[PDB]
Scaffold this motif. Structure first.
Motif, PDB file in Angstrom:
ATOM      1  N   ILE A  69      13.205  -2.108   1.569  1.00  0.00           N
ATOM      2  CA  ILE A  69      13.145  -3.538   1.274  1.00  0.00           C
ATOM      3  C   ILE A  69      14.244  -4.362   1.602  1.00  0.00           C
ATOM      4  O   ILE A  69      15.324  -3.856   1.071  1.00  0.00           O
ATOM      5  CB  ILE A  69      12.523  -3.744  -0.107  1.00  0.00           C
ATOM      6  CG1 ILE A  69      12.211  -5.125  -0.491  1.00  0.00           C
ATOM      7  CG2 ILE A  69      13.772  -3.169  -1.151  1.00  0.00           C
ATOM      8  CD1 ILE A  69      10.762  -5.494  -1.200  1.00  0.00           C
ATOM      9  N   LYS A  70      14.219  -5.218   2.172  1.00  0.00           N
ATOM     10  CA  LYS A  70      15.570  -5.939   2.461  1.00  0.00           C
ATOM     11  C   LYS A  70      15.922  -7.125   1.505  1.00  0.00           C
ATOM     12  O   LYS A  70      17.173  -7.080   1.338  1.00  0.00           O
ATOM     13  CB  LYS A  70      15.519  -6.556   3.875  1.00  0.00           C
ATOM     14  CG  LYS A  70      15.655  -5.809   5.111  1.00  0.00           C
ATOM     15  CD  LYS A  70      15.088  -6.498   6.321  1.00  0.00           C
ATOM     16  CE  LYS A  70      15.168  -5.499   7.545  1.00  0.00           C
ATOM     17  NZ  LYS A  70      13.892  -4.689   7.623  1.00  0.00           N
ATOM     18  N   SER A  71      14.947  -7.523   0.462  1.00  0.00           N
ATOM     19  CA  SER A  71      15.336  -8.421  -0.556  1.00  0.00           C
ATOM     20  C   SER A  71      14.181  -8.178  -1.435  1.00  0.00           C
ATOM     21  O   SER A  71      13.000  -8.042  -1.340  1.00  0.00           O
ATOM     22  CB  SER A  71      15.404  -9.781   0.081  1.00  0.00           C
ATOM     23  OG  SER A  71      14.117 -10.433  -0.020  1.00  0.00           O
TER      24      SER A  71
ATOM     25  N   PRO B  53       0.777  -1.233  -0.010  1.00  0.00           N
ATOM     26  CA  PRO B  53      -0.055  -0.003   0.020  1.00  0.00           C
ATOM     27  C   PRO B  53       0.707   1.301   0.135  1.00  0.00           C
ATOM     28  O   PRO B  53       0.437   2.361  -0.727  1.00  0.00           O
ATOM     29  CB  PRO B  53      -0.817  -0.103   1.373  1.00  0.00           C
ATOM     30  CG  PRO B  53      -0.948  -1.550   1.569  1.00  0.00           C
ATOM     31  CD  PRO B  53       0.314  -2.089   0.911  1.00  0.00           C
ATOM     32  N   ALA B  54       1.985   1.145   0.473  1.00  0.00           N
ATOM     33  CA  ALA B  54       2.844   2.405   0.794  1.00  0.00           C
ATOM     34  C   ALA B  54       3.528   2.811  -0.688  1.00  0.00           C
ATOM     35  O   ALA B  54       4.457   3.769  -0.715  1.00  0.00           O
ATOM     36  CB  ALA B  54       3.907   2.305   1.837  1.00  0.00           C
ATOM     37  N   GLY B  55       3.754   1.782  -1.619  1.00  0.00           N
ATOM     38  CA  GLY B  55       4.301   1.932  -2.813  1.00  0.00           C
ATOM     39  C   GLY B  55       5.644   1.393  -2.927  1.00  0.00           C
ATOM     40  O   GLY B  55       6.344   1.606  -3.937  1.00  0.00           O
ATOM     41  N   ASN B  56       5.796   0.289  -2.066  1.00  0.00           N
ATOM     42  CA  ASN B  56       7.155  -0.486  -2.161  1.00  0.00           C
ATOM     43  C   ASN B  56       6.887  -1.690  -2.758  1.00  0.00           C
ATOM     44  O   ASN B  56       5.704  -2.415  -2.770  1.00  0.00           O
ATOM     45  CB  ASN B  56       7.708  -0.718  -0.781  1.00  0.00           C
ATOM     46  CG  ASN B  56       7.760   0.285   0.153  1.00  0.00           C
ATOM     47  OD1 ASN B  56       8.527   1.220  -0.146  1.00  0.00           O
ATOM     48  ND2 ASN B  56       6.922   0.459   1.060  1.00  0.00           N
ATOM     49  N   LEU B  57       7.877  -2.158  -3.847  1.00  0.00           N
ATOM     50  CA  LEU B  57       7.665  -3.357  -4.620  1.00  0.00           C
ATOM     51  C   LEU B  57       7.838  -4.442  -3.495  1.00  0.00           C
ATOM     52  O   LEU B  57       8.856  -4.255  -2.750  1.00  0.00           O
ATOM     53  CB  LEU B  57       8.765  -3.480  -5.706  1.00  0.00           C
ATOM     54  CG  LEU B  57       8.422  -2.519  -7.049  1.00  0.00           C
ATOM     55  CD1 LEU B  57       9.417  -2.652  -8.176  1.00  0.00           C
ATOM     56  CD2 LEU B  57       6.974  -3.307  -7.745  1.00  0.00           C
ATOM     57  N   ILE B  58       7.075  -5.627  -3.658  1.00  0.00           N
ATOM     58  CA  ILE B  58       7.267  -6.705  -2.766  1.00  0.00           C
ATOM     59  C   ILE B  58       7.535  -7.994  -3.282  1.00  0.00           C
ATOM     60  O   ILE B  58       6.810  -8.028  -4.543  1.00  0.00           O
ATOM     61  CB  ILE B  58       5.975  -6.718  -1.824  1.00  0.00           C
ATOM     62  CG1 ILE B  58       4.623  -6.781  -2.762  1.00  0.00           C
ATOM     63  CG2 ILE B  58       5.876  -5.427  -0.843  1.00  0.00           C
ATOM     64  CD1 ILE B  58       3.436  -6.796  -1.748  1.00  0.00           C
TER      65      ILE B  58
END
Length: 1414
Positions: free
Chosen positions: A1094-1096, A1073-1078
């Motif tokens: 993001i860590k990975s 939701p915050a706009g980070n690729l997961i």
């Protein structure tokens, strides 16, 4: 609180003796209460000789009275004795040759006491400046020497003061004037007090200090005279705190610590008269967010309806202290327009203006003309018994009295020139005149405002002409209070009162209440407390018992102290932290000097004609003005000495404008005095047409392209037409909570946007062209509390009681915390990742230090507030980096330097950047200077730029600056053909290729075709095309590419690109939701990246330092280690043991990239990197980059096989190869062609920038290699990162490897690149911009959501006030808005941002923004 409080003011600002009158009255009351003797009785035996210092005399007498009667002990006794000694010092004659010195010293002591007595009070730089100005005003000596000699002479001064006090006390201790001239003596001390008391000050003189009741008189005076020697002798003790000697010691200590027009004389009094009236100023320094600070009246102005055809707004004005309008026909103490009148009182005639301010007038006005001071409006009588009021302008107000000349009502108004006039018809009942009808016989339109009354003769409905629906409806309680007002849109405002007509609560049209409490129920009672219904903005007001000062406590009991003059003008404001802002005013109440809280000093000088002739800026720059015989501003000389000239027509309109370079702009105006035609310095002519309402309906640019606006009879924008005949239609609500507000917009493509607002204009719901809904929720006080996007994800806002942002909750529920210190300034920020930033401030209140987990940033400032230098110290390693800045007198960055670079900027008289020296100080490389030269046409368009190696780029412009050809060494490289909107529709490249672009109805690029102008079969020339198809939200849904095939894109409801299908590759993107690729493909991965770090992601693993910078990227077979400098800039990269070093200039522009023996220099022109030079043992070359005008999109690259030839810090090399760029709709290079039009370089890149495949005809040819990527991005082969000006972009994870330097100003997610790379760019790494829609009609709406303007008639009443704030010159006039027509003064072509930080102690930006970091 100090025992003694003083009102220190510049002596030039006081014209009345009201404070002297109160001090004399207090002395007389003390005498009557204690000795039971009037001043006349004691006059006879009061023969004492003193200097003619009235302020000192009155202060000394009052202090002696208090000392004799109101005995005090402790620190209060010391303070009162010090003040008595100071007053007595400037009163005794004895050595008359030192009278002026003593008179100057006394206000000095007053100021020192005012700064130092308050708890945690210290002498500041502003205080020292004020002392120096006051000293130089009279004697023109030196502050340090004067203070030293006073310290040496302090003992004799105290002895003389003791003798004088003894003499004064031996007048009332035994049973029975207006000139401050050091060269005159008072024969009798009591006589001047009596003379003062006689004058009719027109001010209340009721003493504010109650005597001790006990009439000690002789005994108290005897005890005084007994202890006076003891108390004054101890005054010389520097050990004792709050004593004159201690004050001098502290001032000297502060001067020593801080040293590493005819001045401004100061005076102080301890007792002041109450403010006669509120000031005309309505700024934050004169009233609460409304209670007036000067007089405490609760004033609310509410508009019930607007008549746009005449620009008339029915403004109801409430004033809790207006008992004269207790029987007002629109509600008790309420004033409607034109209700102003003159009433007879015992003193004479009282006039209540439209704004509600009361001006007493003599009884003789009916027989002779009279003019009021500080306002400039005159009242004259007529032989018929009517009085004409000239308020400033062509409007004359006629007043008639219907009962024996008791109450004069406004019967009619006269516009002598335009012949416009207004009549007032009064229904007279029992000799009481009740307004019945208003006749608006104006050339704009004829309007009939008729009123309907109830049994109480109170207006309950206002009707226009014959319309059945009233413009307003009102309800009243049994006491005659206006308790409900319904506006023309049907929206309701409610009012609540106590049993005495005092407004205790009122609601806006949304029902949100504001509460008020009053000290007493009497009409003259001051409002002492106000708060919103929820408790926010709870303000408490406490007026000083003795001085014209009010302490205003915010919702957290943080006090702000305001001092106001006898006329209500706020001349001094003191903050909780001790910083003070002062205003110096002359006899006409014109602000001559302002010393702000941060110490910035601004001076203004006026000539004998009352014209502003000089402005002295805080940085010392002097602005001079000259006027012709008609009083018209003809000449403006800026701080740099450049001269702007103006000439005027008969209507006092600027007809001709000559800038310092001689370029002439001409203006033509209609009879309305509205700009109708402007002829620029190149001869281009712009035409403006207006409707009868004065609204611009047609604008034709100098190229003959005309855009038009359509308004309805009322004057609401119904449609606007572009030059290419595309119409945007606007529709407004006809019912509900938002009646009369913009409801929907129809775009030329037929798609509609819908809006919903509340009654106060707050956007509640936005429906985009695709039908997706964005909802906004507002808390009780009305601030935004939640924004729910089309994805149903919400951003929540929490505000403290002062409206400052307290917590920001993003779509991931991560919290951004803002902490404020007891003074309310931002001192703590906790980002979504938990990183804590601590802010500190210097004595001037400017951001002093930013303490991050690793780096301590420190700011140094010039006296004018510009950042002189920044230092970045590592708190653990201790390594320090510094930047220095210099500015010209126009506050333009003239020099900026850091460890590896120094940039010098040289400007012409217009402030245009003409020369720029870029001194490279690269390690291991000999210093060298790169010089840029710029030349501009008469309109300020950049036409020629000479690059550091002599290569020149030429811009051929037509009309107002539209580029039609770009020349490289006087050899055309591209020519442009543009449409009616001046958008490029065709370009011809020097390599024989022509590209044609087509746009759809909304202005989006619909297709682009490139092909040879003349096809040749000798070689295969480049021919390609892209066809763009958009969805109802204008998102690029499909691209038909001749080379890549069909490219299909899908988006989420908020427009984030989530899928991309093509022949080459199919990609799916999952965002939290915050706009980070997961890493949705991997189950163990989190569903949300709470910290936005993001860590990975897809085989890549990231490690961050404590400031969010990626320090290591790990993947299969690769380990990239990133070393960051104290500014979070990549200065070293280690890719599998291969070390690359980087360096940047002050503006974050990368200057070099050194990898072992290979060196790559970069040069920049503004925000564009224009050349790169490669140095090595084997290969040397220089590449020049030429961009499309005013864009980051590359046009071509040209270079030669040699290292750039640059000046060495204290013959052009022919370009060998030319390669032409071919970019897509978002400016990303896709292919490159050689000079023969053959494709020599192609790139297949992933959606987010990662290179998938590069096809190059000549692999080893550097001039046919391209590292340019998404606009403003430079691919780095060493790290596979994209350098993006301020940050490095990571294509794999579609994010920057460091946090946004500007924080939340660049977006909620300080690491995300862009939501949709098909149309958004982010070229500098700071802010993401929508590039696809930059040239779209939807992006040119004259009324986006509330952008509506209607002020056709501010005329009716007006006073004219430059007495409230200092005039900011800026552009002076600016003239006409809209399409753009009007210039003058100021202006800076090729602007330069010092460090892009500037500030950052800011918050509460509504739409996503927190900091002030530029």
């Amino acid at each position: 609180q100090p025992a003694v409080e003083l009102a220190v003011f510049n002596l030039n600002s006081v014209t009345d003796v009201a404070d002297l009158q109160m001090i004399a009255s207090q002395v007389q009351l003390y005498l009557q209460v204690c000795g039971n003797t009037t001043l006349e009785q004691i006059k006879s035996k009061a023969n004492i000789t003193t200097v003619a210092n009235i302020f000192a005399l009155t202060g000394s007498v009052l202090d002696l009275m208090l000392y004799a009667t109101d005995k005090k002990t402790g620190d209060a006794a010391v303070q009162r004795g010090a003040l008595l000694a100071a007053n007595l010092i400037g009163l005794f004659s004895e050595p008359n040759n030192e009278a002026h010195a003593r008179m100057a010293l006394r206000p000095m002591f007053g100021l020192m006491a005012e700064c130092l007595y308050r708890e945690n009070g210290k002498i500041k730089e502003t205080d020292i400046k004020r002392l120096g100005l006051h000293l130089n005003a009279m004697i023109a000596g030196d502050l340090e020497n004067f203070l030293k000699e006073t310290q040496a002479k302090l003992s004799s001064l105290l002895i003389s003061a003791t003798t004088l006090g003894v003499t004064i006390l031996q007048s009332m201790a035994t049973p029975a004037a207006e000139k401050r001239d050091p060269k005159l003596k008072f024969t009798n001390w009591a006589v001047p007090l009596i003379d003062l008391l006689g004058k009719p000050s027109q001010a209340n003189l009721t003493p504010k200090i109650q005597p001790n009741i006990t009439s000690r008189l002789q005994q108290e005076a005897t005890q005084a005279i007994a202890a006076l020697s003891q108390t004054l002798q101890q005054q010389a003790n520097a050990g004792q705190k709050y004593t004159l000697a201690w004050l001098l010691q502290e001032t000297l200590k502060a001067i020593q610590a801080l040293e590493n027009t005819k001045g401004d004389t100061l005076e102080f009094v301890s007792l002041q008269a109450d403010a006669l009236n509120a000031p005309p100023c309505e700024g934050a320094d004169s009233q609460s967010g409304s209670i007036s600070y000067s007089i405490g009246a609760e004033r609310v102005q509410h508009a019930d309806f607007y008549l746009p055809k005449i620009g008339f707004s029915f403004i109801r004005q409430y004033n809790s202290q207006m008992d004269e309008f207790d029987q007002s026909m629109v509600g008790a103490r309420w004033m409607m327009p034109f209700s102003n009148m003159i009433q007879q009182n015992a003193q004479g005639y009282l006039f209540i203006d439209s704004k509600g301010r009361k001006h007493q007038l003599p009884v003789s006005i009916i027989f002779e003309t009279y003019e009021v001071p500080y306002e400039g409006w005159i009242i004259k009588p007529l032989k018929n018994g009517e009085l004409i009021l000239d308020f400033g302008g062509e409007w004359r107000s006629h007043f008639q009295s219907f009962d024996g000349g008791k109450n004069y009502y406004l019967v009619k108004k006269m516009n002598e020139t335009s012949q416009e006039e207004i009549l007032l018809e009064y229904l007279l009942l029992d000799h009481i005149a009740y307004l019945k009808v208003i006749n608006f016989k104006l050339k704009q339109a004829e309007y009939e405002l008729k009123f309907a009354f109830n049994e109480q003769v109170k207006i309950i409905a206002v009707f226009l002409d014959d319309k059945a629906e009233p413009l307003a409806r009102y309800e009243y309680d049994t006491q005659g209070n206006l308790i409900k007002a319904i506006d023309q849109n049907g929206h309701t405002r409610t009012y609540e009162y106590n049993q005495f007509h005092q407004l205790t609560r009122y609601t806006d049209r949304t029902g949100r209440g504001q509460n008020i409490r009053y000290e007493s129920t009497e009409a003259k009672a001051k409002a002492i407390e106000e708060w919103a219904d929820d408790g926010s903005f709870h303000t408490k007001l406490k007026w000083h018992p003795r001085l014209r000062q009010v302490a205003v406590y915010d919702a957290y009991d943080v006090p702000t102290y305001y001092y106001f003059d006898l006329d209500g003008f706020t001349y001094r404001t003191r903050l909780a932290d001790g910083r003070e802002s002062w205003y110096s005013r002359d006899g006409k109440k014109r602000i001559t000097r302002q010393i702000d809280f941060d110490g910035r000093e601004t001076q203004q000088e006026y000539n004998d004609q009352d014209q502003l002739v000089k402005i002295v800026q805080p940085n010392g720059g002097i602005i001079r003005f000259a006027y012709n015989k008609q009083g018209n501003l003809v000449e403006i000389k800026d701080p740099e000495g450049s001269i702007w000239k103006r000439e005027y027509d008969e209507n006092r309109n600027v007809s001709k404008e000559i800038n310092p370079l001689g370029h002439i702009t001409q203006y033509k105006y209609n009879n309305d005095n509205q700009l109708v035609e402007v002829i620029d310095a190149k001869g281009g002519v712009k035409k403006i047409q207006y409707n009868e309402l004065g609204q611009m309906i047609s604008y034709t640019d100098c190229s003959g392209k005309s855009s038009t606006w359509e308004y309805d009879e009322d004057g609401a924008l119904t449609a606007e037409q572009t030059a290419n005949n595309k119409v945007v239609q606007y529709f407004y609500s006809t019912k509900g909570r938002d009646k009369g507000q913009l409801q929907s917009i129809i775009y030329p493509d037929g798609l509609k946007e819908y809006f919903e607002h509340d009654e106060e204009g707050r956007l509640l719901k936005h429906t985009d062209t695709k039908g997706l809904v964005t909802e906004y929720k507002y808390n009780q006080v009305g601030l935004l509390e939640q924004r729910i996007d089309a994805n149903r994800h919400s951003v929540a806002y929490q505000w403290d009681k002062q409206g400052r942002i307290q917590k920001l909750i993003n779509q991931n529920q991560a919290e951004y915390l803002f902490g404020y210190n007891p003074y309310g300034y931002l001192i703590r920020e906790q980002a979504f990742d938990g990183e804590e930033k601590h802010y500190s401030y210097n004595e001037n209140g400017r951001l002093f230090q930013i303490r991050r987990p690793n780096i301590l940033t420190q700011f140094d400032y010039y006296a004018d507030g510009q950042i002189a230098s920044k230092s970045f110290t590592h708190l653990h390693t201790g390594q320090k980096q510094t930047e220095q800045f210099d500015y010209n007198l126009n506050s333009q960055l003239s020099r900026a330097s850091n460890e590896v670079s120094q940039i010098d900027l040289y400007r012409n008289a217009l402030g245009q950047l003409v020369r720029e020296h870029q001194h490279y100080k690269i390690p291991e490389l000999k210093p060298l200077t790169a010089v840029l030269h710029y030349e501009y046409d008469e309109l300020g368009n950049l036409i020629k730029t000479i690059r550091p190696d002599g290569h020149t780029l030429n811009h051929l412009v037509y009309g107002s600056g539209h580029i039609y050809a770009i020349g490289l060494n006087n050899q055309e490289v591209v020519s442009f053909q543009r449409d009616d909107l001046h958008r490029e529709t065709t370009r011809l490249l020097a390599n024989g290729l022509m590209q044609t672009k087509q746009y759809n109805d909304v202005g989006l690029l619909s297709s682009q075709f490139i092909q040879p102008e003349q096809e040749t079969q000798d070689y295969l020339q480049y021919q390609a095309h892209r066809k763009y198809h958009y969805d109802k939200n204008y998102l690029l849904s499909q691209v038909e590419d001749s080379r890549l095939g069909k490219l299909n894109y899908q988006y989420d409801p908020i427009g984030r690109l989530i899928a991309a299908q093509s022949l080459h590759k199919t990609e799916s993107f999952n965002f939290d939701p915050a706009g980070n690729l997961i890493d949705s493909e991997s189950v163990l991965s989190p569903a949300q990246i709470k910290n936005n770090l993001i860590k990975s992601y897809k085989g890549k693993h990231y490690q961050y330092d404590v400031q969010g910078n990626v320090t290591e990227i790990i993947q299969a077979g690769k380990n990239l280690k990133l070393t960051w400098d104290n500014q979070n800039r990549l200065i070293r990269s280690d890719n599998n043991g291969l070390v690359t070093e980087y360096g940047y200039d002050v503006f974050g522009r990368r200057l070099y990239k050194k990898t072992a023996k290979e060196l790559t220099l970069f040069g920049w022109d503004g925000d564009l990197m224009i050349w790169e030079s490669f140095k090595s043992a084997q290969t040397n070359y220089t590449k020049h980059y030429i961009y499309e005008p005013d864009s980051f999109v590359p046009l071509l690259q040209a270079g030669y096989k040699d290292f750039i030839q640059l000046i060495e810090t204290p013959e052009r090399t022919a370009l060998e190869q030319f390669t032409f760029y071919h970019c897509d709709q978002v400016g990303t290079p896709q292919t490159m062609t050689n000079i023969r039009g053959e494709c020599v370089w192609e790139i297949l890149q992933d959606t987010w920038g990662a290179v998938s495949q590069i096809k190059a005809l000549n692999q080893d040819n550097p001039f046919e290699q391209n590292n340019l990527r998404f606009q403003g991005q430079y691919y780095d082969r060493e790290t596979e990162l994209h350098y993006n000006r301020y940050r490095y972009y990571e294509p794999h994870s579609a994010r920057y490897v460091s946090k946004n330097p500007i924080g939340l100003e660049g977006g909620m997610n300080t690491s995300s690149y862009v939501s949709d790379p098909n149309q958004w760019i982010n070229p500098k790494g700071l802010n993401s911009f929508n590039y696809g829609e930059m040239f779209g009609i939807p992006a040119s709406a004259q009324s986006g959501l509330a952008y509506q303007g209607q002020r056709n008639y501010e005329c009716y009443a007006e006073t004219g006030e430059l007495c409230k704030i200092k005039v900011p010159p800026l552009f002076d006039y600016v003239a006409c808005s809209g399409g753009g027509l009007g210039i003058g003064v100021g202006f800076v072509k090729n602007q330069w941002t010092g460090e892009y930080y500037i500030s950052g102690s800011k918050d509460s930006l509504l739409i996503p923004v927190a900091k002030s970091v530029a």
